[model samples]
Target: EPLIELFVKAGSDGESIGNCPFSQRLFMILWLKGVVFSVTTVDLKRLQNLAPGTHPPFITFNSEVKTDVNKIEEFLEEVLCPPKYLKLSPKHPESNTAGMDIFAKFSAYIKNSRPEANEALERGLLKTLQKLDEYLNSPLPKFSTRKFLDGNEMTLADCNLLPKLHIVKVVAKKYRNFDIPKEMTGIWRYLTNAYSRDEFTNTCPSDKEVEIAYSDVAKRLTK
Candidate 1:
């Protein structure tokens, strides 16, 4: 078997364990694909030798070295998925457009965390979430898992999406003292289902672990 090792940042939980959303995303991909690999955790500041000039969640597969979460997913794609699944932006153009727009808005808000902008940020997050909810609630074939936003199928988008949403849930509650509105039923349901997956819950760190790992960044972004 090909040797694989994943390096991530340390959390309060254990050695070789961390709460990077990107790393968690990679973990989900590997676990869901049934790929067996060893994972190690180190203080990100100390892992510079393994992943110079970048962040943790880097991987060493045999002789190959890669950094960046997106690149990691692409590498895993060749290792696991084969030209599989629909491109989320293409499958749902409207949602794709909204996601981009909302991302820009959210990015700006985070970059400049105006104390008075809470309502604006909340609305933006709500809208961004609603778009996903609508797509998930939309029609789909009977054979589909209907569990994913893109219907029953597991797409790269699902792997991409769940982690992002998960982080928002963690950050908003832990830092901003807020919650995804109770009315966002589909959003709630989708998150609940995704987090419940064995590949997810098993590999994921605890909420406190995630909070501790990201609290600094959250403070910087929302301060």
Candidate 2:
């Protein structure tokens, strides 16, 4: 098989993979599936020429280029079939929506500058977290004894959610002094399980890179 080529945004140093959760999500999937791939760091200026109206975090393989992350995921799943590789598609409804709105809510919370609106934004973020926590602890047959969102096996949902959650964990705490509530034990346990996975740990950007990636947004919104 020809080596898969991935282009992702460069970090503050302009050399390594930066803090795009979408990019890291792809990287995690590749690693989890044991696909042999090489990553290239790209800046926005070069991305315009390389992808044209799209962006970095795209993949080039077998003379085909995929810029949409969803398409890229589908391509990979089809090419890297399961049994040999772990199938990552969510098998349950809960897994499908797990942590879906977290990043958006976290963004809203951090970006708001109005004091009057801050409490509502914070509540929104907390509500999402609470929802995820409840799902994790639910007695539903699908979730019972499951170690990940889908099951004992990790799924695309986990690969997608964990990277974004990492950014939320790093950026929210640093910028807003907010933390995932300890009362949400299920969430913490889920995170600990994910953090232990090599695919996640290897693909995840450094906490500092995550902060740097969001610094512009933080500055713009706060000011």
Candidate 3:
């Protein structure tokens, strides 16, 4: 907590700033990480926005998205299960049906749910986010990462999955989306379990801060 406050309070000491990723004066002080995200996630999306699992959740494809269970599968299949960013691997249960099934279930989740935010668009956004929550916490094939090298009490899943969720929130909006289906009861409980912890929330900013940080990228996006 002190480390984060140190950075945030440092750069932001000055009011004048430019429209830049590093000098944002907001997030740099918040999460010291996420810097190259501009080049990695953002630019790559700029390169392949319409390619399935490549675009923000909102971007369309022939009046619908071209999604599948490919996100975890292909990434893990290609050795991108997060820690590969740091260059290492463990059990590599990276193989699993949950990959595609997660997205399929997500798509179904949205279809069945509606929001009473009293607005259709808001309702739709709610459904989109709920599906996101379901997908993130969904069970994996019991793989492992260096974080837990000797077989994790946890695994290379959501701890690594958090940033991806934030991306959805940025491209999608809001924090901790939820739809909670019966079949995924375990996943849902696990996700909720981790999210409710003090360490987790303390290390991260509130949903309001997430919105504030991503606003710059949002402003630059050619809507």
Q: Specify the highest-lDDT model's number.
A: 2
Candidate 1, run of 10 with poorest lDDT: 81-90
User: Model 2 clash pairs?
Assistant: none
Candidate 2 has what TM-score?
Answer: 0.91
Clash count in backbone of candidate 3: 4
Candidate 1, superposed: residue stretches over 4 Å from native: 12-16, 47-51, 81-113, 140-145, 218-223
Residues 55-157, candidate 2, lDDT per residue (tens digit)?
A: 7788888756787898999989888886677667888877879779999999888887777777888899999999988888786553354578877788888
The models' CA-based lDDT, in order, is 0.64, 0.83, 0.32
Candidate 3 to truth, TM = 0.32
lDDT of 3 at 111: 36
Alpha-carbon TM-score of each model against the true structure = 0.77, 0.91, 0.32
Model 1 per-residue lDDT tens digits across residues 1-223: 5677887777864564666667777877776666678787867444334433666778888867777888887777766644442232225444333233434444444444566776777788778767766666666532223676555545556666666666667766777776777776677677778777777677667778867765555544344
Model 3 per-residue lDDT tens digits across residues 97-148: 1232333332333333233422454345445445543444444354222222
Arranged by TM-score, best first: 2, 1, 3
Residue 157, candidate 1: alpha-carbon lDDT: 63
Supply the TM-score for candidate 1.
0.77
Ranking by lDDT: 2, 1, 3
